[PDB]
């Protein structure tokens, strides 16, 4: 399939080169995979989700995404227009309040929720979690992400937007999960993107057009926006049977566009997520 005039991120993940505007992808499109978006929640009722999104868990008075960011990231994963995996099931876990903040305990709870909740969900192709969040280092947060991974969820996490070594941020610094850096459309590490040895991949992170709350759309920037590309991409790849949860990161890294990013510090991988679709 070919989505024309797609967000640049989508076109980039289906291309060897920057500067193309068409997303190419196998029409399976993540059908039968699930992605948990562990964030501020999802406006399930956005027409871009076509009934494939729902809230499954909140730790606040409401399941409603009053922030937008979880909705944005859900759209990058699997909205029909802005999504990598246009047929994936999206499950919202609202661990963040509507100001984007959450306690680590609550985040941890959410991660463990997913690890169990997936046994209540029909994801014959596999399950992904997209954690578009991060604070300072915490071994409890790291180990929660690791448990989630160990349970057979492909965990994608934002490197962080500190322009620092991601070693100092959690869950970015958990080795067992996929830590995602952000790139911009001229194939540069996004100025804000964390880096370091713990990064596994880069995805599109600068000026990412996706869904927003109030049935709208907007473009925003962040490694948090890169993460759902990788997550969507794992969902897409699992559906194609190219990989499982426990290998998906390694697979995505093995099939990435290599050496294409500039301003990648020495020691950080020069890998850009690539769907490797050949139409």
PDB file of C-alpha atoms in Angstrom:
ATOM      1  CA  UNK A   1       0.000   0.000   0.000  1.00  0.00           C
ATOM      2  CA  UNK A   2       0.985   3.560  -0.442  1.00  0.00           C
ATOM      3  CA  UNK A   3      -0.343   6.507   1.532  1.00  0.00           C
ATOM      4  CA  UNK A   4       0.443   9.691  -0.419  1.00  0.00           C
ATOM      5  CA  UNK A   5       1.272  12.980   1.250  1.00  0.00           C
ATOM      6  CA  UNK A   6       1.821  11.133   4.476  1.00  0.00           C
ATOM      7  CA  UNK A   7       3.431  12.762   7.508  1.00  0.00           C
ATOM      8  CA  UNK A   8       7.142  12.889   6.913  1.00  0.00           C
ATOM      9  CA  UNK A   9       7.755  10.382   9.735  1.00  0.00           C
ATOM     10  CA  UNK A  10       5.743   7.712   8.053  1.00  0.00           C
ATOM     11  CA  UNK A  11       7.374   8.297   4.719  1.00  0.00           C
ATOM     12  CA  UNK A  12      10.789   8.171   6.399  1.00  0.00           C
ATOM     13  CA  UNK A  13      10.165   4.813   8.039  1.00  0.00           C
ATOM     14  CA  UNK A  14       9.302   3.278   4.682  1.00  0.00           C
ATOM     15  CA  UNK A  15      12.258   4.880   2.824  1.00  0.00           C
ATOM     16  CA  UNK A  16      16.087   4.495   2.510  1.00  0.00           C
ATOM     17  CA  UNK A  17      16.298   8.212   1.774  1.00  0.00           C
ATOM     18  CA  UNK A  18      14.906  11.339   3.404  1.00  0.00           C
ATOM     19  CA  UNK A  19      12.664  13.836   1.534  1.00  0.00           C
ATOM     20  CA  UNK A  20       9.866  11.528   0.283  1.00  0.00           C
ATOM     21  CA  UNK A  21       6.180  12.038   1.137  1.00  0.00           C
ATOM     22  CA  UNK A  22       4.656   8.645   0.542  1.00  0.00           C
ATOM     23  CA  UNK A  23       4.350   5.924   3.232  1.00  0.00           C
ATOM     24  CA  UNK A  24       4.634   2.374   1.873  1.00  0.00           C
ATOM     25  CA  UNK A  25       3.634  -0.572   3.910  1.00  0.00           C
ATOM     26  CA  UNK A  26       2.121  -4.019   3.631  1.00  0.00           C
ATOM     27  CA  UNK A  27      -1.715  -3.808   3.832  1.00  0.00           C
ATOM     28  CA  UNK A  28      -1.767  -6.247   6.796  1.00  0.00           C
ATOM     29  CA  UNK A  29      -0.846  -3.024   8.628  1.00  0.00           C
ATOM     30  CA  UNK A  30      -0.541  -4.497  12.106  1.00  0.00           C
ATOM     31  CA  UNK A  31      -3.967  -6.252  12.040  1.00  0.00           C
ATOM     32  CA  UNK A  32      -4.141  -8.657  14.998  1.00  0.00           C
ATOM     33  CA  UNK A  33      -1.454  -6.909  17.051  1.00  0.00           C
ATOM     34  CA  UNK A  34      -2.122  -4.653  20.041  1.00  0.00           C
ATOM     35  CA  UNK A  35      -0.342  -1.575  21.121  1.00  0.00           C
ATOM     36  CA  UNK A  36      -0.595  -0.256  24.604  1.00  0.00           C
ATOM     37  CA  UNK A  37       0.004   3.425  24.739  1.00  0.00           C
ATOM     38  CA  UNK A  38       1.054   4.211  28.275  1.00  0.00           C
ATOM     39  CA  UNK A  39       0.669   7.961  28.414  1.00  0.00           C
ATOM     40  CA  UNK A  40      -2.081  10.536  29.156  1.00  0.00           C
ATOM     41  CA  UNK A  41      -4.861   8.357  27.650  1.00  0.00           C
ATOM     42  CA  UNK A  42      -6.516   8.240  24.213  1.00  0.00           C
ATOM     43  CA  UNK A  43      -9.492  10.019  22.794  1.00  0.00           C
ATOM     44  CA  UNK A  44     -10.886   6.783  21.509  1.00  0.00           C
ATOM     45  CA  UNK A  45     -13.671   8.594  19.761  1.00  0.00           C
ATOM     46  CA  UNK A  46     -11.282  10.326  17.256  1.00  0.00           C
ATOM     47  CA  UNK A  47     -12.400   9.300  13.751  1.00  0.00           C
ATOM     48  CA  UNK A  48      -8.772   8.564  12.922  1.00  0.00           C
ATOM     49  CA  UNK A  49      -8.937   5.522  15.227  1.00  0.00           C
ATOM     50  CA  UNK A  50     -11.900   3.960  13.482  1.00  0.00           C
ATOM     51  CA  UNK A  51     -13.113   2.171  16.648  1.00  0.00           C
ATOM     52  CA  UNK A  52      -9.738   0.408  17.088  1.00  0.00           C
ATOM     53  CA  UNK A  53      -8.824   2.521  20.151  1.00  0.00           C
ATOM     54  CA  UNK A  54     -10.127   2.198  23.640  1.00  0.00           C
ATOM     55  CA  UNK A  55      -9.122   3.175  27.118  1.00  0.00           C
ATOM     56  CA  UNK A  56      -8.455   0.139  29.269  1.00  0.00           C
ATOM     57  CA  UNK A  57      -7.101   1.676  32.437  1.00  0.00           C
ATOM     58  CA  UNK A  58      -6.708   4.977  34.156  1.00  0.00           C
ATOM     59  CA  UNK A  59      -5.295   5.881  37.563  1.00  0.00           C
ATOM     60  CA  UNK A  60      -7.119   9.175  37.717  1.00  0.00           C
ATOM     61  CA  UNK A  61     -10.734  10.275  37.945  1.00  0.00           C
ATOM     62  CA  UNK A  62     -11.107  10.053  34.170  1.00  0.00           C
ATOM     63  CA  UNK A  63      -9.920   7.915  31.273  1.00  0.00           C
ATOM     64  CA  UNK A  64     -10.296  10.958  29.069  1.00  0.00           C
ATOM     65  CA  UNK A  65      -7.123  12.290  27.543  1.00  0.00           C
ATOM     66  CA  UNK A  66      -7.274  15.881  28.636  1.00  0.00           C
ATOM     67  CA  UNK A  67      -3.696  16.488  27.567  1.00  0.00           C
ATOM     68  CA  UNK A  68      -3.570  15.256  23.968  1.00  0.00           C
ATOM     69  CA  UNK A  69      -0.163  13.672  24.021  1.00  0.00           C
ATOM     70  CA  UNK A  70      -1.323  10.102  24.516  1.00  0.00           C
ATOM     71  CA  UNK A  71      -3.800  10.668  21.785  1.00  0.00           C
ATOM     72  CA  UNK A  72      -1.067  12.067  19.598  1.00  0.00           C
ATOM     73  CA  UNK A  73       1.148   9.136  20.231  1.00  0.00           C
ATOM     74  CA  UNK A  74      -1.740   6.650  19.756  1.00  0.00           C
ATOM     75  CA  UNK A  75      -2.319   8.256  16.382  1.00  0.00           C
ATOM     76  CA  UNK A  76       1.307   7.833  15.391  1.00  0.00           C
ATOM     77  CA  UNK A  77       1.081   4.181  16.310  1.00  0.00           C
ATOM     78  CA  UNK A  78      -2.093   3.378  14.528  1.00  0.00           C
ATOM     79  CA  UNK A  79      -4.357   6.114  13.303  1.00  0.00           C
ATOM     80  CA  UNK A  80      -5.537   5.538   9.804  1.00  0.00           C
ATOM     81  CA  UNK A  81      -3.854   8.709   8.513  1.00  0.00           C
ATOM     82  CA  UNK A  82      -0.959   9.387  10.869  1.00  0.00           C
ATOM     83  CA  UNK A  83      -0.237   5.877  12.081  1.00  0.00           C
ATOM     84  CA  UNK A  84       2.385   3.372  11.294  1.00  0.00           C
ATOM     85  CA  UNK A  85       0.151   0.394  11.924  1.00  0.00           C
ATOM     86  CA  UNK A  86      -3.206   1.396  10.523  1.00  0.00           C
ATOM     87  CA  UNK A  87      -5.077  -1.765  11.630  1.00  0.00           C
ATOM     88  CA  UNK A  88      -3.537  -2.348  15.050  1.00  0.00           C
ATOM     89  CA  UNK A  89      -5.610  -2.356  18.234  1.00  0.00           C
ATOM     90  CA  UNK A  90      -4.694   0.555  20.495  1.00  0.00           C
ATOM     91  CA  UNK A  91      -5.081   0.255  24.287  1.00  0.00           C
ATOM     92  CA  UNK A  92      -4.775   3.341  26.372  1.00  0.00           C
ATOM     93  CA  UNK A  93      -3.248   3.219  29.801  1.00  0.00           C
ATOM     94  CA  UNK A  94      -3.492   6.640  31.362  1.00  0.00           C
ATOM     95  CA  UNK A  95      -0.630   6.812  33.840  1.00  0.00           C
ATOM     96  CA  UNK A  96      -0.145  10.502  33.381  1.00  0.00           C
ATOM     97  CA  UNK A  97      -2.465  13.231  34.537  1.00  0.00           C
ATOM     98  CA  UNK A  98      -3.749  15.823  32.117  1.00  0.00           C
ATOM     99  CA  UNK A  99      -0.665  18.090  32.913  1.00  0.00           C
ATOM    100  CA  UNK A 100       1.507  15.251  31.583  1.00  0.00           C
ATOM    101  CA  UNK A 101       2.790  14.356  35.064  1.00  0.00           C
ATOM    102  CA  UNK A 102       2.551  11.040  36.926  1.00  0.00           C
ATOM    103  CA  UNK A 103       4.209   9.515  39.953  1.00  0.00           C
ATOM    104  CA  UNK A 104       6.673   6.669  39.281  1.00  0.00           C
ATOM    105  CA  UNK A 105       4.536   4.298  41.372  1.00  0.00           C
ATOM    106  CA  UNK A 106       1.606   5.001  39.068  1.00  0.00           C
ATOM    107  CA  UNK A 107       3.737   4.515  35.975  1.00  0.00           C
ATOM    108  CA  UNK A 108       5.066   1.267  37.411  1.00  0.00           C
ATOM    109  CA  UNK A 109       1.536   0.130  38.155  1.00  0.00           C
ATOM    110  CA  UNK A 110       0.624   0.875  34.535  1.00  0.00           C
ATOM    111  CA  UNK A 111       3.450  -1.145  33.182  1.00  0.00           C
ATOM    112  CA  UNK A 112       2.518  -4.125  35.341  1.00  0.00           C
ATOM    113  CA  UNK A 113      -1.118  -3.625  34.309  1.00  0.00           C
ATOM    114  CA  UNK A 114      -0.107  -4.105  30.707  1.00  0.00           C
ATOM    115  CA  UNK A 115       1.853  -7.212  31.473  1.00  0.00           C
ATOM    116  CA  UNK A 116      -1.342  -8.795  32.886  1.00  0.00           C
ATOM    117  CA  UNK A 117      -3.911  -6.989  30.795  1.00  0.00           C
ATOM    118  CA  UNK A 118      -2.516  -8.417  27.583  1.00  0.00           C
ATOM    119  CA  UNK A 119      -3.850 -11.782  28.738  1.00  0.00           C
ATOM    120  CA  UNK A 120      -7.290 -10.221  28.582  1.00  0.00           C
ATOM    121  CA  UNK A 121      -6.739  -9.048  24.987  1.00  0.00           C
ATOM    122  CA  UNK A 122      -6.692 -10.733  21.645  1.00  0.00           C
ATOM    123  CA  UNK A 123      -3.301  -9.972  20.142  1.00  0.00           C
ATOM    124  CA  UNK A 124      -2.492 -13.155  18.275  1.00  0.00           C
ATOM    125  CA  UNK A 125       0.319 -11.305  16.436  1.00  0.00           C
ATOM    126  CA  UNK A 126       1.798  -9.766  19.506  1.00  0.00           C
ATOM    127  CA  UNK A 127       1.708  -6.960  21.908  1.00  0.00           C
ATOM    128  CA  UNK A 128       3.608  -3.715  22.015  1.00  0.00           C
ATOM    129  CA  UNK A 129       3.824  -0.995  24.636  1.00  0.00           C
ATOM    130  CA  UNK A 130       4.767   2.538  23.699  1.00  0.00           C
ATOM    131  CA  UNK A 131       5.966   4.461  26.762  1.00  0.00           C
ATOM    132  CA  UNK A 132       6.241   8.011  25.588  1.00  0.00           C
ATOM    133  CA  UNK A 133       7.452   9.262  28.954  1.00  0.00           C
ATOM    134  CA  UNK A 134      10.467   9.377  31.140  1.00  0.00           C
ATOM    135  CA  UNK A 135      11.950  11.012  34.168  1.00  0.00           C
ATOM    136  CA  UNK A 136      15.249  10.693  35.984  1.00  0.00           C
ATOM    137  CA  UNK A 137      16.820   7.369  36.718  1.00  0.00           C
ATOM    138  CA  UNK A 138      14.890   4.916  38.878  1.00  0.00           C
ATOM    139  CA  UNK A 139      15.658   1.269  39.177  1.00  0.00           C
ATOM    140  CA  UNK A 140      12.016   0.561  40.101  1.00  0.00           C
ATOM    141  CA  UNK A 141      10.844   2.179  36.837  1.00  0.00           C
ATOM    142  CA  UNK A 142      13.590   0.406  34.874  1.00  0.00           C
ATOM    143  CA  UNK A 143      12.737  -2.937  36.333  1.00  0.00           C
ATOM    144  CA  UNK A 144       9.021  -2.409  35.623  1.00  0.00           C
ATOM    145  CA  UNK A 145       9.837  -1.772  31.976  1.00  0.00           C
ATOM    146  CA  UNK A 146      12.029  -4.877  32.041  1.00  0.00           C
ATOM    147  CA  UNK A 147       9.227  -7.001  33.510  1.00  0.00           C
ATOM    148  CA  UNK A 148       6.890  -5.732  30.875  1.00  0.00           C
ATOM    149  CA  UNK A 149       9.412  -6.706  28.257  1.00  0.00           C
ATOM    150  CA  UNK A 150      10.062 -10.105  29.878  1.00  0.00           C
ATOM    151  CA  UNK A 151       6.290 -10.781  29.761  1.00  0.00           C
ATOM    152  CA  UNK A 152       6.429 -10.769  25.914  1.00  0.00           C
ATOM    153  CA  UNK A 153       5.471  -7.184  25.286  1.00  0.00           C
ATOM    154  CA  UNK A 154       7.728  -5.293  22.951  1.00  0.00           C
ATOM    155  CA  UNK A 155       8.485  -2.191  24.948  1.00  0.00           C
ATOM    156  CA  UNK A 156       9.451   0.989  23.130  1.00  0.00           C
ATOM    157  CA  UNK A 157      10.569   3.870  25.267  1.00  0.00           C
ATOM    158  CA  UNK A 158      11.522   7.450  24.653  1.00  0.00           C
ATOM    159  CA  UNK A 159      15.191   8.220  25.081  1.00  0.00           C
ATOM    160  CA  UNK A 160      14.222  11.553  26.604  1.00  0.00           C
ATOM    161  CA  UNK A 161      14.427  15.113  25.374  1.00  0.00           C
ATOM    162  CA  UNK A 162      17.262  16.359  27.525  1.00  0.00           C
ATOM    163  CA  UNK A 163      20.060  16.260  24.878  1.00  0.00           C
ATOM    164  CA  UNK A 164      21.891  14.086  27.392  1.00  0.00           C
ATOM    165  CA  UNK A 165      23.141  10.600  27.693  1.00  0.00           C
ATOM    166  CA  UNK A 166      19.991   8.545  28.221  1.00  0.00           C
ATOM    167  CA  UNK A 167      21.793   6.387  30.894  1.00  0.00           C
ATOM    168  CA  UNK A 168      20.403   8.865  33.443  1.00  0.00           C
ATOM    169  CA  UNK A 169      16.754   8.593  32.537  1.00  0.00           C
ATOM    170  CA  UNK A 170      14.211   5.883  33.136  1.00  0.00           C
ATOM    171  CA  UNK A 171      12.840   3.811  31.543  1.00  0.00           C
ATOM    172  CA  UNK A 172      15.176   5.004  28.744  1.00  0.00           C
ATOM    173  CA  UNK A 173      18.152   3.307  30.492  1.00  0.00           C
ATOM    174  CA  UNK A 174      16.660  -0.139  30.929  1.00  0.00           C
ATOM    175  CA  UNK A 175      18.802  -2.286  28.577  1.00  0.00           C
ATOM    176  CA  UNK A 176      16.167  -4.933  27.906  1.00  0.00           C
ATOM    177  CA  UNK A 177      13.697  -2.470  26.251  1.00  0.00           C
ATOM    178  CA  UNK A 178      13.875  -0.505  22.928  1.00  0.00           C
ATOM    179  CA  UNK A 179      15.117   2.991  23.677  1.00  0.00           C
ATOM    180  CA  UNK A 180      14.190   5.391  20.910  1.00  0.00           C
ATOM    181  CA  UNK A 181      15.996   8.561  19.897  1.00  0.00           C
ATOM    182  CA  UNK A 182      14.394  11.252  17.771  1.00  0.00           C
ATOM    183  CA  UNK A 183      15.437  12.338  14.350  1.00  0.00           C
ATOM    184  CA  UNK A 184      14.216  15.215  12.188  1.00  0.00           C
ATOM    185  CA  UNK A 185      13.247  15.235   8.524  1.00  0.00           C
ATOM    186  CA  UNK A 186      16.732  16.207   7.235  1.00  0.00           C
ATOM    187  CA  UNK A 187      17.976  13.035   8.908  1.00  0.00           C
ATOM    188  CA  UNK A 188      19.617  14.741  11.858  1.00  0.00           C
ATOM    189  CA  UNK A 189      19.401  13.745  15.444  1.00  0.00           C
ATOM    190  CA  UNK A 190      16.775  16.089  16.814  1.00  0.00           C
ATOM    191  CA  UNK A 191      18.548  18.751  18.858  1.00  0.00           C
ATOM    192  CA  UNK A 192      16.616  17.706  21.935  1.00  0.00           C
ATOM    193  CA  UNK A 193      17.108  13.948  21.600  1.00  0.00           C
ATOM    194  CA  UNK A 194      18.955  12.065  24.277  1.00  0.00           C
ATOM    195  CA  UNK A 195      21.673   9.783  23.072  1.00  0.00           C
ATOM    196  CA  UNK A 196      24.197   7.275  24.431  1.00  0.00           C
ATOM    197  CA  UNK A 197      24.989   3.618  24.353  1.00  0.00           C
ATOM    198  CA  UNK A 198      21.579   2.667  25.697  1.00  0.00           C
ATOM    199  CA  UNK A 199      19.792   3.965  22.542  1.00  0.00           C
ATOM    200  CA  UNK A 200      18.692   1.183  20.232  1.00  0.00           C
ATOM    201  CA  UNK A 201      17.077   3.045  17.371  1.00  0.00           C
ATOM    202  CA  UNK A 202      16.012   6.423  16.072  1.00  0.00           C
ATOM    203  CA  UNK A 203      12.602   7.270  14.795  1.00  0.00           C
ATOM    204  CA  UNK A 204      11.022  10.451  13.458  1.00  0.00           C
ATOM    205  CA  UNK A 205      10.734  12.858  16.333  1.00  0.00           C
ATOM    206  CA  UNK A 206      10.710  16.429  15.013  1.00  0.00           C
ATOM    207  CA  UNK A 207       7.398  17.971  13.904  1.00  0.00           C
ATOM    208  CA  UNK A 208       5.264  14.871  13.980  1.00  0.00           C
ATOM    209  CA  UNK A 209       1.807  15.370  12.707  1.00  0.00           C
ATOM    210  CA  UNK A 210      -0.732  13.175  14.505  1.00  0.00           C
ATOM    211  CA  UNK A 211      -4.120  13.082  16.164  1.00  0.00           C
ATOM    212  CA  UNK A 212      -4.996  15.374  18.978  1.00  0.00           C
ATOM    213  CA  UNK A 213      -7.884  15.804  21.445  1.00  0.00           C
ATOM    214  CA  UNK A 214     -11.114  17.397  20.219  1.00  0.00           C
ATOM    215  CA  UNK A 215     -11.038  15.305  17.028  1.00  0.00           C
ATOM    216  CA  UNK A 216      -8.199  17.534  15.817  1.00  0.00           C
ATOM    217  CA  UNK A 217      -4.583  17.106  14.736  1.00  0.00           C
ATOM    218  CA  UNK A 218      -1.278  18.764  15.511  1.00  0.00           C
ATOM    219  CA  UNK A 219       2.419  18.523  14.897  1.00  0.00           C
ATOM    220  CA  UNK A 220       4.734  18.344  17.842  1.00  0.00           C
ATOM    221  CA  UNK A 221       8.257  17.312  18.590  1.00  0.00           C
ATOM    222  CA  UNK A 222       9.860  14.869  20.971  1.00  0.00           C
ATOM    223  CA  UNK A 223      11.531  11.499  21.432  1.00  0.00           C
ATOM    224  CA  UNK A 224       8.176  10.678  22.905  1.00  0.00           C
ATOM    225  CA  UNK A 225       6.812  11.154  19.348  1.00  0.00           C
ATOM    226  CA  UNK A 226       9.586   8.975  17.945  1.00  0.00           C
ATOM    227  CA  UNK A 227       8.712   6.087  20.230  1.00  0.00           C
ATOM    228  CA  UNK A 228       5.224   5.399  18.826  1.00  0.00           C
ATOM    229  CA  UNK A 229       6.765   5.153  15.340  1.00  0.00           C
ATOM    230  CA  UNK A 230       8.944   2.326  16.580  1.00  0.00           C
ATOM    231  CA  UNK A 231       6.090   0.815  18.521  1.00  0.00           C
ATOM    232  CA  UNK A 232       3.827   0.995  15.490  1.00  0.00           C
ATOM    233  CA  UNK A 233       6.637  -0.401  13.481  1.00  0.00           C
ATOM    234  CA  UNK A 234       7.031  -3.375  15.875  1.00  0.00           C
ATOM    235  CA  UNK A 235       3.331  -4.001  15.722  1.00  0.00           C
ATOM    236  CA  UNK A 236       3.518  -3.897  11.964  1.00  0.00           C
ATOM    237  CA  UNK A 237       6.512  -6.237  11.893  1.00  0.00           C
ATOM    238  CA  UNK A 238       5.004  -8.718  14.313  1.00  0.00           C
ATOM    239  CA  UNK A 239       1.833  -8.932  12.288  1.00  0.00           C
ATOM    240  CA  UNK A 240       3.989  -9.776   9.238  1.00  0.00           C
ATOM    241  CA  UNK A 241       5.616 -12.534  11.336  1.00  0.00           C
ATOM    242  CA  UNK A 242       9.078 -10.980  10.844  1.00  0.00           C
ATOM    243  CA  UNK A 243       9.653 -11.008  14.572  1.00  0.00           C
ATOM    244  CA  UNK A 244       8.246 -11.560  18.064  1.00  0.00           C
ATOM    245  CA  UNK A 245       8.168  -9.143  21.006  1.00  0.00           C
ATOM    246  CA  UNK A 246      11.376 -10.396  22.553  1.00  0.00           C
ATOM    247  CA  UNK A 247      13.387  -9.916  19.328  1.00  0.00           C
ATOM    248  CA  UNK A 248      11.575  -6.991  17.744  1.00  0.00           C
ATOM    249  CA  UNK A 249      14.016  -4.367  18.935  1.00  0.00           C
ATOM    250  CA  UNK A 250      16.960  -6.376  17.651  1.00  0.00           C
ATOM    251  CA  UNK A 251      15.131  -7.014  14.417  1.00  0.00           C
ATOM    252  CA  UNK A 252      14.268  -3.301  13.919  1.00  0.00           C
ATOM    253  CA  UNK A 253      17.902  -2.438  14.665  1.00  0.00           C
ATOM    254  CA  UNK A 254      19.141  -5.145  12.297  1.00  0.00           C
ATOM    255  CA  UNK A 255      16.886  -3.807   9.502  1.00  0.00           C
ATOM    256  CA  UNK A 256      17.323  -0.112  10.218  1.00  0.00           C
ATOM    257  CA  UNK A 257      18.743   2.383   7.802  1.00  0.00           C
ATOM    258  CA  UNK A 258      22.344   2.633   9.021  1.00  0.00           C
ATOM    259  CA  UNK A 259      24.683   5.602   8.913  1.00  0.00           C
ATOM    260  CA  UNK A 260      22.060   8.018   7.658  1.00  0.00           C
ATOM    261  CA  UNK A 261      21.780  10.325  10.635  1.00  0.00           C
ATOM    262  CA  UNK A 262      24.024  13.248  11.261  1.00  0.00           C
ATOM    263  CA  UNK A 263      24.867  14.764  14.622  1.00  0.00           C
ATOM    264  CA  UNK A 264      24.887  11.336  16.221  1.00  0.00           C
ATOM    265  CA  UNK A 265      27.476  11.447  18.960  1.00  0.00           C
ATOM    266  CA  UNK A 266      30.243   8.888  18.935  1.00  0.00           C
ATOM    267  CA  UNK A 267      29.038   5.819  20.891  1.00  0.00           C
ATOM    268  CA  UNK A 268      25.402   6.112  19.898  1.00  0.00           C
ATOM    269  CA  UNK A 269      23.960   3.840  17.215  1.00  0.00           C
ATOM    270  CA  UNK A 270      23.384   5.368  13.806  1.00  0.00           C
ATOM    271  CA  UNK A 271      20.184   3.447  13.142  1.00  0.00           C
ATOM    272  CA  UNK A 272      16.919   4.778  11.774  1.00  0.00           C
ATOM    273  CA  UNK A 273      13.750   2.681  11.941  1.00  0.00           C
ATOM    274  CA  UNK A 274      12.891   1.238   8.597  1.00  0.00           C
ATOM    275  CA  UNK A 275      10.004  -0.977   7.628  1.00  0.00           C
ATOM    276  CA  UNK A 276      11.924  -2.557   4.778  1.00  0.00           C
ATOM    277  CA  UNK A 277       8.755  -2.767   2.709  1.00  0.00           C
ATOM    278  CA  UNK A 278       9.307  -3.391  -1.009  1.00  0.00           C
ATOM    279  CA  UNK A 279       6.036  -2.601  -2.753  1.00  0.00           C
TER     280      UNK A 279
END
